[PDB]
């Protein structure tokens, strides 16, 4: 990896948990997991791993967040749903002068989906969720962070489908879906990128190739 110490914020999330297992199996990274009630949620083989540290708390707990990112070289933000939560995280990172962040957001906010997929997508999301995501993004942009935003299309689970393509900012986003396992691979690959340039304060889409559909199929 390009980093040794990573803090995963929102560590019980589906992508976060899969990322955790992948980083334990395939790297020598030291991982700090943060989120609500982790000790009674995260599997025992993860909690008891020598390279795992577990801290319980919410994105609105300044002291605990700061503890969680104290020794981080990179921070993964597992949800970007709330401006207020994003602000709390940015403030904690600022207090410890942590700079490198990878965050996951929803694709489509900027009109990048083609018309039918865009229509289906917004028919299937509350306005409040969408505008929350847009606000979280704005907060991250205002920060001093060397961030990468991953704009994810519709998610599903399939260990056999780990192919992904990155979609540059402003490009038409034609992929209607992507597996969580493929997103984990994309995160793994960015964490191993010798050249961070294309990921430096950029917003990149992640989609499954060949899923040019009018709606996600989730399989
Ligand atoms: N569903 C889709 O198709 C889709 C597509 C694109 C993007 N996304 C979004 O991309 C993100 C990652 O996907 P995912 O499948 O891994 O979602 P996920 O399972 O819901 O994981 C998100 C995690 O963030 C945690 N979290 C959010 N706010 C928090 C707070 N204030 N304090 C502590 N923890 C907090 C949640 O904790 P708790 O479990 O304790 O509530 C949850 O475990 C999510 O934000 C998701 O909504 C979803
Ligand atoms: Cl704790």
Q: Atom 15 in ligand 1: which residue has the minimum CA distance?
A: 14
Residues 6+ apart with CB under 8 A from 111: 118
Distance CA 206, CA 194 (A): 19
Split into its structural domains, the chain has a count of 1
Which residues constitute the domain of residue 169? Answer: 1-219
Given resolution (angstroms): 1.6
Distance CA 52, CA 120 (A): 40
Positive/negative CA dihedral, 74, 132, 173, 23:
positive
Please state the φ and ψ torsions of residue 86, each to the nearest 5 degrees.
-65, -40
113 lines ligand 1 (CB under 6 A): no
Output the domain CATH number for residue 213.
3.40.50.720
Q: Atom 21 in ligand 1: which residue has the minimum CA distance?
A: 13
Distance CA 200, CA 210 (A): 27
Helix 83-95 × helix 127-142 angle, to 10°: 20
Q: Atom 41 in ligand 1: which residue has the minimum CA distance?
A: 36
Residues 6+ apart with CB under 8 A from 18: 180, 181, 184
34 lines ligand 1 (CB under 6 A): no
Technique employed here was X-ray
HSE-up (13 A, CA, CB side) for residue 40: 3
């Amino acid at each position: 990896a390009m980093y040794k110490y990573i803090t995963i914020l929102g560590a019980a999330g589906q992508i976060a948990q899969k990322l955790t297992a992948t980083l334990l199996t395939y790297t020598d990274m030291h991982i700090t997991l943060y989120g609500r009630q982790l000790k009674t949620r995260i599997p025992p083989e993860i909690i008891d791993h020598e390279r795992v540290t577990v801290i319980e708390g919410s994105f609105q707990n300044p002291g605990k967040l700061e503890q969680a990112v104290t020794n981080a070289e990179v921070v993964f933000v597992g949800a970007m749903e709330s401006g207020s939560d994003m602000a709390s995280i940015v403030k904690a990172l600022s207090r410890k002068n942590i700079r490198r962040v990878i965050g996951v957001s929803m694709a489509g906010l900027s009109g990048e989906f083609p018309v039918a997929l865009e229509k289906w997508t917004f028919d299937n999301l509350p306005i409040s969720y969408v505008q929350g995501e847009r606000q979280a993004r704005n907060v991250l942009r205002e920060s001093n962070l060397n961030y990468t935003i991953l704009r994810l299309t519709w998610l599903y689970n399939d260990p056999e489908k780990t192919d992904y393509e990155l979609i540059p900012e402003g490009a038409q986003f034609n992929d209607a879906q992507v597996s969580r396992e493929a997103v984990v691979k994309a995160i793994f690959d960015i964490l191993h990128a010798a050249d961070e340039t294309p990921f430096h304060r950029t917003s990149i889409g992640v989609g499954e190739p060949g899923t040019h559909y009018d709606k996600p199929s989730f399989h």
